């Protein structure tokens, strides 16, 4: 029941744009439930929003390994790669996000 509260704490801090503390409670959520792709995704979102694209790529990767149908994650890892000047993997991720968009 308990990463149902950590995730929500992280969510509540995310919703208010407090990424530093959002990360703190997203990481606690991931300690208890290391399988929830949604946790990997939102933690990926938090780093991305800070401009920590290196870590954003890292965490989106596993969110996409556990849920490859997450088109939003594909797209955001695509921006991350683009920011880093990785234009090949950016293209690669962008297309995969659009193939899930009718």
């Amino acid at each position: 029941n308990s990463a149902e509260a950590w995730k929500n704490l992280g969510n509540a801090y995310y919703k208010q744009g407090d990424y530093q503390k959002a990360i703190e409670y997203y990481q606690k959520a991931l300690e208890l439930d290391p399988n929830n792709a949604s946790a990997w995704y939102n933690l990926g979102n938090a780093y991305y929003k800070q401009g920590d694209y290196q870590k954003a790529i890292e965490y989106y990767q596993k969110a996409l390994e556990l849920d490859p149908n997450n088109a939003k994650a594909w797209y955001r890892r695509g921006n991350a790669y683009y920011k880093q000047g990785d234009y090949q993997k950016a293209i690669e991720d962008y297309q995969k996000a659009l193939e899930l968009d009718p």
Binding site: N11, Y14, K15, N45, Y48, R76
Partner: peptide, 5 residues
């Protein structure tokens, strides 16, 4: 700006 699901 980006949303959340």
């Amino acid at each position: 700006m980006e949303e959340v699901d």
